[PDB]
Amino acid sequence: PAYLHPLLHQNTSTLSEQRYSSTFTGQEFFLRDHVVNGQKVLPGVAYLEMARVAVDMAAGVRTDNHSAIQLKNIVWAKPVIVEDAPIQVHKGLYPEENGEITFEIYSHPREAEESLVVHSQGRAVLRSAMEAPALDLSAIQAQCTESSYSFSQCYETFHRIGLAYGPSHQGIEKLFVGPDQVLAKLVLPSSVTGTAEKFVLHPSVMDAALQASLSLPFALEELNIYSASTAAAWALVRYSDGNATTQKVQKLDIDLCDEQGTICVSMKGFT
Amino acid sequence: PAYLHPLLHQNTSTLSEQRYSSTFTGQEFFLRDHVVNGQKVLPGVAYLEMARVAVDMAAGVRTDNHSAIQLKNIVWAKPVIVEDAPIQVHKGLYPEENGEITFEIYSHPREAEESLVVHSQGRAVLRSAMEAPALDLSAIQAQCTESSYSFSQCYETFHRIGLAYGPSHQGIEKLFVGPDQVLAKLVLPSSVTGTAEKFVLHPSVMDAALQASLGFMMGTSDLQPSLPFALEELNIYSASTAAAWALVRYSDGNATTQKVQKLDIDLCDEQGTICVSMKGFTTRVLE
Ligand SMILES: [Mg+2]
């Protein structure tokens, strides 16, 4: 209730370490409605919001020259899973000499409070606020005319493939695809509209952007925030120009834009 | 409701600054019952607990060689006053290269949030727990037979000079005075017993120990209140709640004036075992 943020509850910083802590019950919407293979698993897109708001607050009152946050070189390790007992997640920030901020998202195993498990790591950059780029909504939709499928068709396999998305994570409206890209109409589930205000990178919309692509998120090269993900009405997914099939891991680009095509959130070098 | 401590509610630390924040409404017992010249004033001794608990928390889990806190060279500047508008008070901690921790207690006036008021600053030292010294209460009593003052005498006199202590700050039971010292019988007011557990340096007990210096000033014409101005050293051997007595004597500086007095103050339980010691405590007339 008195949380600083639904994903960043409490500031637990010491003289040695800048740190934020959150205790998650199974009931949070981004857990109860994000069940993979039967377990409540923290979604990859929640780590980004966790990281952003930690940086936003850990950096003090800021000048226009530092009043914007960008994330770089994100990594994903073991996921956070919730059972009958709550799970405490720690968000650690470490300032580097070049003015960038390294962040580690970790926890202390109930198996061993002296052992440690890292779930994600990355870097953040403070820059001047960025003017939003623009996308071509009319033509891009026109380049995605082959084998369109309903959200339900997207949704049916998702449930069948082992990903049981609850109502809070049913943000895709429809998929328009060509062999080169996928453009997804997006919507905010009505359940989470009451709390969409308290997110910049909203897990429902951000995950819907990731859902439109789909083995699992493994890394992200860069994340740019021009406006709230809530403003988004469309999202475009494309391969990064690496052209490597490899095994089951791929490098992809994902962008969010509003009704006019103005990009508000863009993700580069996904993996 | 979710305070870390009644005097240190929230950790608001940034990368640049280790910081804790508290918002006081004035309904807190240590404000509602601590009225100076008609205004609710945070008691000077409350800053001491503020610093201690901030340091204790800002210092991590700690080895025993560092599992004890001492405060040094405390100064008091403008008071914290609450009159209908809540005040947000910040505890800033800076680690010094010598391993000491500097603390600043400050706030930003609501009327111009870009301005700054520093209320108190000092230094904290992390060191090994000290075996608690002891007082000989029998011997001390034998030297405080010159005059004596009752509970009502003290708090009626306090009200007359401008210090309207409510029940939470009525910890003096009786004052025994001899030449150059005062022995004060103390008790934790019944009003605050429910939350005495969450204080090491309890404002009620600590303020009562400083109140005991009234013993030196009874009989002073148009006596004016003297408030905390500086403290050279504070030693914490155990919680003040255990305290049953307080000894007040002048520090061996021989610099006593109506404007300012410097005192040595010890608090001990019924056996004479000291729990808190304050050396070089200077108080100054209010004006
Ligand atoms: Mg102004």
TrEMBL record, chain B:
Region (N-terminal hotdog fold): 5-131
Cited function: Involved in some intermediate steps for the synthesis of the antibiotic polyketide bacillaene which is involved in secondary metabolism.
PKS/mFAS DH domain location: 5-287
Organism superkingdom: Bacteria
Shown part of the complete sequence: 2214 to 2500 of 3950
Region feature (C-terminal hotdog fold): 145-287
Catalytic residues of the enzyme: H34, D207
Name of the protein: Putative polyketide synthase
Subcellular location: Cytoplasm
